[PDB]
Design a protein around this ligand. Structure first.
Ligand SMILES: Nc1ncnc2c1ncn2[C@@H]1O[C@H](COP(=O)(O)OP(=O)(O)OP(O)(O)=S)[C@@H](O)[C@H]1O
Ligand SMILES: Nc1ncnc2c1ncn2[C@@H]1O[C@H](COP(=O)(O)OP(=O)(O)OP(O)(O)=S)[C@@H](O)[C@H]1O
Ligand SMILES: [Zn+2]
Ligand SMILES: [Zn+2]
Ligand SMILES: [Zn+2]
Ligand SMILES: [Zn+2]
Lengths: 338, 364, 334, 364, 366
């Protein structure tokens, strides 16, 4: 299985077509790109019929299994596209795939797609099969160091002069959801055809664009002054956010916060962060919180969240926002006793 | 309803969506036309209005323009919704579930009248697993002369693949001042009466949903019978702020029975959700109690209040304040078990008054 | 369904009246779950639905014996709770009511059986009584409840209450020392944590459950002297939250139980654990904890889909709070 | 059966519905009648008795009187139900559904024997949309020589149109003593054996219903020997009928724990009614607390524990008994939150234990 | 003799009470013809939901044409005000017996008025409909005929899909203040020439909870027992409350710390068959007023007079602090009732508590 990057794919495709193509990674567009890059050469061969079946334990597998079991009377062929689960091929699916691993024939091109595979999942009978015929195309979101480079490269193919500083800002918001970044680019292509994206030009478009993730709220709450926090909240309403999703998002970060503070003298803040593995830059920020939130401030914040969560689901629609507001203010100043 | 009567006919007619207008306008001025658009945002922000304008500058007999002339038969029948080349589909309706499944399995590649065969699917996230893959197979192979204008209030319930082949445009809600200033106009050109207060009681009410604001403004004339006075506006939209909810707190610390009672009478006069009055009160007490710990404890709209609140913060011992929080708190908890709601409140303040820190009442 | 032994002493007399004429058309069996309710009703009914009984039991050939083994019969009506909801409707009954007004398809005795009478609507009930006031010739009813109290006075005044009391402790234990080998104190506790219903005690072990307990117990073991209750999260967080929560309680109450000198502790399983609790936890603090625990549990139980993690992760931290001195403790309210 | 036997014959025999008989009576004695009376009330509170007793006086050969003479033919006949002019309709009966529609359509504007054709409808609200209007039409145009007596246990299920034509009289549930005091009378006048308790229990049994209260006395006579006694009765309701009720309090108040705890387990084994047990304790905490306000409070059956009751009374502090009482009351509420209806009970006593004057105190 | 409950049943829109705003909105529509396909009316029970619903159907099929001011004589107006009109189908979704008449009528919509302009469908609480016929509406509402119009009423618009709420013109009818009904009833008895003690009107008033329809219903019972008068004594009788005198005569005795008198009055009272919870609702009432006059002697009604000298005494003589205690003591009293093993017991037990915890002379312990 020739392992290679999206970029070498077009080159490899040329030399010939291989039994099956494994698109593994989390990036929305590379997967897409690599995908269409494949089919573009298949229909270009004799593959008119194209199929796509998602892997979730609740699928209708007889349909699938028997659709490839059949050789065609008119040699018409097909392109089977399996959509791997979100979590990926569990134990029962290490076989379900091992089965379709010895059926392939030069007139049934296989293209599996999902997020990368774990060292374990990459030994599950099935993968080890394609292990000779196939090819895998690593599709992963570039890191913090190449993140901006990507935006620079790509931009350049969209015939764009995106300044470094204008590149940075963009890279700091939507820091990661490659999806949007790819978007805001073709959009900006549109604002200024034959224009330049100086820092003043992009920074405003982005500033005014004013989109806040409830993640933005939380992060503020991360000891950041309440001002922005509260604003991002009422803004986060006029973005028709559901309150249920705000609650549990802060939870993850508020609970995480309890442990960490709980583990002082357990292990230096350092070692700990890795351990939980959310520490992506948030480390400085998480730390900063863990310096002003008292063991008790935490709890209070946890009792409230609960009241909210509960009060949210027991009188279904008592305008929770009220409480959320108070809540945030709690995570920003010393507290009292009621 | 003023809702339909004032629907935008031109890009100059759209309230605060600049970053979306400038974009669409320009991509229309330089003949740059993608194969599919997607407008996302909340209720009555103008997703539909901009999609329709968009379809209109594309099929303007005057030519592909950022400024449809608005008088062509292409512009008129599109305005009417009776445009052969403007197939509108609702993925939200229960009744048209079949005409929504078929209009896509049978896309029409050749335009009947204008230059384009535009489609517009409201709440496009509401399609059937079937209709999805259908619109996917179509945008994967964008049939020319066939454009796709999508709208959704939740571009997240959409598969990435489809969102992948579109050009999204996030519309923001509208400012409370961006609306009040949009009414003051819509009104003054329809020669109707109004008070600056009323206009703000309305804008606010509409939660960034202009559509609603107007749909509300019609009723306020329906009930106010012609005039848009605060009185009629607040009639349906209760006294949404009344700095008395606080005036009661103070009236309470000052231990000015006469005012407390008086003030309640004024609230009762209007008729308020009693216990609401309690929580409100409490919660003030609760911030004032906060404020006096970390002064930077006054959020966004605390501004009008600001001075009033601070004064209390300082001038009143953190203890006495807990006493109130508590007393007040407790009175709510018993409220439904009071001979009568208002009484319950009066009677609970009376509590504080005799159980007051300084100033408590006497006996002979 | 599984006729246990202890159901014979009672099955004996009961049939003794159906054979001597002194049988009540309305038999309400108050009994725990997994104590045998189930089988004793099915058992008696089979005797009464015998065309050619051989004395104490059926023959197995006759139309009755056959149709009954077959399952479907013309006089055996099962008024269970509407498939789905958790209540019995006025309807189900009213149709089974008239359904008796017509003579026996096999010409003999008709029979009705109710899952748990304490599960019908005040309406579904009364609808019934009128049937019991006007008893449909040679017919037999059988009601069973866990708690006969929660049952309409006027109603329960129309039937004979039969207390399927559980068997002696030693007996039950023995009977269990056979069905599964475990330290006899883990057999006792397994019994006590079940009201004394052997069957119940049986299905505790019968899963990874009873070991799931151990897991928890151990936790507390440290959680108590350490003062770290947050650690419990581990053991309590899970689908079986209620179930487990109920355990943490029992122990709790055992601590209080000791604090006053009660002669009987439920989790005899781990006397070390309960005494340790009756230490770093004054009476009044178990109390509170027993409190929140019985509550929170219940929240999960009822409130459709709360965030279990949140709840339990809150309960815990707060318990810790109760512990801290100066802190003031929760009292029952209204 | 006693229930049928003691059906009221004259108003003076109706128990606890004064605001009603008051009206009705005052109505009759002044020839002031209406054409449609609607009687709302729960089960066996007196609906059918009063309507029947009204009709009895409307038609008495002696005259329109609130005091049926009860010896003239119309009265005797109304008593056996054989009164041609006493048309009893059961709007809840599925059997006669046809006779209903028929007779009403084939109305009798002309009464055969008495001065008024009286229609008595039970559970009116359960009428067929058709009947509803059939009637409603007759109420709009009340044929003279006709009166409508409506009786429902849920008046709301009725059409505001029918409601409005009617004079509405609600029937309140009977307080306990009320029911019990009648049972006493009954039983005496019928020369039967009875013991106080069995009468207490019996009353408490028929929740606020005098009808269930009697029909229950019947089953209770039927159960034991023709003798309404504590055993006989609790033998239907399966009640404890044992001083563990009190035997339990005593301990609690000495802070015996071991004992209380003990007392319960040994109680679990019997198969007690847990909630019921509480109910009794509060019960005693009261006859006690009350014996304290006046040494006469004790009454009829507790001459059985007189001494004991009195001992508590004179030794435990009035103040302290409230707190017990109150705590238990609370636990009765929370009885269902606790996983175990018993943990509940124990949870609760162990509660009044500590919160005692000098009880168990902390240690590591 | 004519139960006002019928004699004042609203006929025009003018006859309705205090719900102006929601009437004005209907005064327009009918006047400008802006007739939508669906009308929604939300509100507690007792608020003129149905009542105001008829007043629409009386202004839709009226022969005088579509008016906001129907004429009370035309054959259509009369039959409508008698629940029997060929095009006025009245469905009660909460109805058990009529469930099959509910399903068959919503799937069998008649697209042709038999005697009126439109065909009116009045539905009491639609959120209570069957899953089957509920959809029958959904569809008929999406594409509704021109002649068929709908009138919906709910005790809770929440449990109504947003699929229908958006498809109708909502109208929330607020219950009526106490002093509003108090005013109506006064103006109705004054206009019916009936004697009447003020104190007694407020009683009938609050008795009916913001429900004028009901307020009249009771007003009638009172008039029947009062022998042509609405006297506090007849009223309090029915309600089974305490005659302002007796409430205060307990309080008075409660304050005085003497049980006997209390327990005595309870019987004396249990004799009249009181409604136990109300023997507290009424004391609490007074206690409230007392401590209120201690804050402003002005705070005293205008019929309180008959008991005024006594109100003022207590007030000027007991510590507000103190009073705030009895108030709360009975308050929490009411609270427990449902759990007191007997509504009387709870009520006696509770005054004892007051007595056991009196603050000037508590019950003594040897
Ligand atoms: N940005 C805007 N500028 C001017 N008028 C607007 C704007 N948004 C809404 N309106 C008014 O609101 C009505 C509805 O706006 P639409 O464009 O249909 O909103 P929408 O965002 O599509 O809303 P939905 O369908 O509820 S998601 C129009 O007919 C206008 O009168
Ligand atoms: N208020 C009462 N005073 C005296 N005896 C009563 C009273 N209420 C009921 N009873 C007894 O209960 C029996 C039935 O009472 P009914 O008047 O038929 O009750 P009801 O309110 O019509 O009940 P239904 O039919 O269940 S709704 C009578 O025959 C009486 O013996
Ligand atoms: Zn044009
Ligand atoms: Zn047999
Ligand atoms: Zn007579
Ligand atoms: Zn008319």
């Amino acid at each position: 299985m020739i392992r290679l990057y999206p970029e070498q794919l077009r080159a490899q495709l040329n030399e010939g077509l291989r039994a099956a193509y494994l698109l593994l990674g989390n990036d929305p567009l590379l997967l897409q790109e690599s995908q269409d890059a494949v089919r573009q050469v298949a229909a270009a061969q004799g593959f008119e019929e194209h199929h796509t079946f998602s892997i979730d334990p609740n699928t209708d597998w007889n349909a699938i299994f028997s659709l490839c079991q059949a050789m065609s009377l008119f040699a018409s062929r097909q392109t089977l596209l399996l959509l791997l689960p979100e979590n990926g091929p569990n134990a029962a699916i290490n076989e379900q795939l091992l089965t379709l691993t010895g059926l392939l024939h030069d007139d049934l091109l296989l293209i599996v797609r999902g997020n990368k595979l774990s060292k374990a999942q990459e030994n599950a009978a099935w993968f080890t099969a394609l292990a000779n015929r196939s090819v895998q195309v690593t599709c992963q979101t570039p890191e913090q160091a190449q993140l901006p480079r990507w935006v620079a490269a790509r931009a350049k193919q969209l015939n764009l002069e995106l300044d470094d500083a204008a590149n940075q800002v963009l890279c700091y918001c939507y820091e990661g959801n490659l999806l949007a970044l790819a978007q805001a680019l073709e959009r900006l292509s549109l604002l200024w055809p034959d224009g330049k994206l100086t820092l003043p030009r992009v920074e405003q478009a982005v500033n005014d664009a004013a989109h806040f993730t409830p993640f933005h709220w939380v992060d503020a709450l991360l000891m950041g002054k309440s001002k922005r926090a509260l604003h991002i909240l009422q803004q986060l309403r006029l973005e028709g956010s559901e309150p249920v999703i705000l609650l549990r998002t802060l939870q993850r970060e508020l609970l995480l916060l309890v442990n960490l503070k709980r583990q002082s003298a357990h292990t230096p803040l350092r070692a700990l962060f890795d351990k939980h593995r959310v520490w992506q830059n948030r480390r400085g920020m998480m730390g900063e919180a863990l310096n002003r939130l008292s063991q008790t401030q935490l709890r209070q914040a946890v009792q409230l969240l609960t009241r909210t969560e509960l009060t949210l689901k027991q009188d279904y629609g008592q305008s929770v926002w009220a409480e959320l507001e108070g809540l945030s203010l709690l995570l920003c100043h010393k507290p009292l006793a009621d | 309803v003023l809702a339909r009567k004032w629907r935008p006919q031109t890009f100059a007619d759209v309230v605060g969506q600049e970053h979306v207008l400038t974009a669409l306008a320009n991509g229309l001025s330089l003949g740059r036309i993608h194969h599919a658009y997607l407008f996302s945002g909340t209720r009555g922000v103008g997703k539909t209005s901009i999609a329709r304008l968009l379809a209109k500058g594309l099929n303007c007999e005057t030519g592909i323009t950022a400024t449809p002339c608005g008088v062509c038969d292409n512009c008129r029948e599109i305005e009417q919704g009776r445009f052969v080349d403007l197939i509108e589909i609702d993925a939200a309706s229960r009744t048209k579930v079949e005409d929504t499944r078929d209009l896509l399995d049978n896309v029409q590649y050749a335009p009947a009248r204008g230059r384009f065969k535009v489609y517009l699917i409201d709440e496009v996230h509401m399609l059937s697993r079937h209709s999805f893959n259908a619109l996917l197979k179509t945008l994967e192979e964008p049939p020319e002369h066939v454009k796709f204008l999508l709208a959704t209030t939740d571009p997240q319930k959409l598969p990435v693949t489809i969102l992948s082949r579109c050009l999204q445009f996030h519309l923001k809600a509208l400012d409370v001042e961006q609306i009040r200033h949009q009414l003051e106009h819509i009104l003054n050109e329809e020669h109707i009466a109004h008070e600056p207060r009323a206009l703000q009681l309305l804008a606010r009410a509409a939660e960034g949903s202009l559509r609603d604001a107007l749909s509300l403004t019609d009723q306020a004339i329906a009930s106010g019978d012609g005039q848009v006075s605060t009185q009629a506006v607040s009639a349906m939209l209760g006294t949404l702020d009344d700095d008395q909810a606080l005036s009661l707190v103070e009236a309470m610390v000052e231990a000015n029975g006469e005012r407390v009672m008086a003030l309640i009478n004024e609230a009762a006069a209007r008729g308020i959700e009693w216990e609401a009055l309690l929580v409100e009160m409490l919660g003030l007490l609760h911030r004032i109690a906060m404020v006096q710990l970390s002064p930077a404890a006054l959020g966004n709209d605390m501004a009008a209040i600001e001075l009033r609140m601070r004064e209390l913060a300082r001038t009143i011992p953190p203890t006495d304040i807990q006493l109130y929080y508590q007393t007040l708190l407790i009175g709510r908890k018993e409220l439904p078990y009071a001979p009568d709601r208002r009484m319950g409140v009066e009677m609970t303040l009376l509590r504080a008054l005799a159980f007051h820190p300084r100033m408590p009442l006497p006996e002979p | 369904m599984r006729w246990y032994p202890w159901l014979r002493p009672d099955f004996e007399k009961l049939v003794a009246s159906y054979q001597a004429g002194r049988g009540h058309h309305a038999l309400l069996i108050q009994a725990l779950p997994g104590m045998g309710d189930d089988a004793l009703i099915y058992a008696l009914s089979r005797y009464l639905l015998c065309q050619q009984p051989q004395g104490h039991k059926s023959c197995g050939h006759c139309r009755g014996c056959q149709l009954m083994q077959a399952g479907t019969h013309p006089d055996y009506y099962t008024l269970a709770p509407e498939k789905g909801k958790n209540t019995l409707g006025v309807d189900a009954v009213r149709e089974v009511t008239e359904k008796l007004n017509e003579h026996a398809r096999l010409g003999g005795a008709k029979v009705v059986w109710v899952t748990d009478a304490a599960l019908l609507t005040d309406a579904a009930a009364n609808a019934l009584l009128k049937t019991l006031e006007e008893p449909p010739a040679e017919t037999w009813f059988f009601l069973a409840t866990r708690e006969p109290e929660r049952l309409l006075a006027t109603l329960r005044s129309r039937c004979r209450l039969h207390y399927l009391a559980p068997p002696p402790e030693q007996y039950a234990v023995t009977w269990l020392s056979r069905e599964v080998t475990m330290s006899q104190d883990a057999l006792l506790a397994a019994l006590r944590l079940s009201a004394g219903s052997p069957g119940a005690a049986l299905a505790l072990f019968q899963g990874d459950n009873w070991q799931a307990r151990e897991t928890l117990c151990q936790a507390l073991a440290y959680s108590v002297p350490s003062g770290d209750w947050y650690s419990l999260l581990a053991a309590l967080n899970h689908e079986q939250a209620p179930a487990r929560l109920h355990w943490l309680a029992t122990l709790l109450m055992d601590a209080l139980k000791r604090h006053h000198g009660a002669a009987q502790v439920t989790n005899v399983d781990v006397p070390g654990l309960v005494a340790e609790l009756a230490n770093h936890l004054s009476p009044s603090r178990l109390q509170a904890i027993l409190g929140d625990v019985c509550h929170i549990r219940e929240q999960l139980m009822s409130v459709t889909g709360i965030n279990r993690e949140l709840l339990i992760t809150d309960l815990l931290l707060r318990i810790e709070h109760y512990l801290q001195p100066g802190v003031v403790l929760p009292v029952p309210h209204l």
